[PDB]
Structure 1
Amino acid sequence: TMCYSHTTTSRAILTNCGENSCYRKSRRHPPKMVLGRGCGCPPGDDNLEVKCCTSPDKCNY
């Protein structure tokens, strides 16, 4: 799968996650700032919400 990729301090690029899943890290409560996008499916937390997905392309937007 083709998903977005970036940290807190880099612009969003496209990357080939492949058969893995994607993720969208964000602040759980408002303001819901996006803090990350990439490959895999990492744990979130009280302050960090993670959203996972598998398809289609650009699904972690």
Structure 2
Amino acid sequence: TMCYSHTTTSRAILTNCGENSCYRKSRRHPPKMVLGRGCGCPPGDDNLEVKCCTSPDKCNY
């Protein structure tokens, strides 16, 4: 799948994740600053919210 990819210090770019899902790491509570997107579906935490997807393509936005 064609999803977004980046870190806390890089600008979001497109990447081909393929059959894996994608993710959107953000701060759980406001401000819900986006911390990173990429391939896969990694664990979050009290302060880290992770949202995954597959179908949409560029869905982890």
For Structure 1 versus Structure 2, the TM-score category normalised by the shorter chain is over 0.9
Q: CA deviation at 1:41?
A: 0.4
Displacement of 1:57 in angstroms is: 1.3
- Runs of at least 4 residues of structure 1 off by over 3 A? none
The Cα of 1:44 is off from its aligned counterpart by 0.1
How many residues are matched? 61
Note the alpha carbon deviations across 1:3-40, whole angstroms, 9 max, x for none.
00000000000000000000000000000000000000
Which runs of 5 or more residues in structure 1 are unaligned? none
Considering only aligned residues, what root-mean-square deviation do their CA atoms show, in Å? 0.4
Percent of aligned pairs with the same residue? 100
Question: How high is the TM-score relative to the length of structure 1?
Answer: 0.98
Q: Which runs of 5+ in 2 are unaligned?
A: none
Q: Distance in 1 between matches of 2:14 and 2:60?
A: 11
TM-score, normalisation: structure 2? 0.98
Distance, in Å, in 2 between the alignment partners of 1:4 and 1:33 is 16
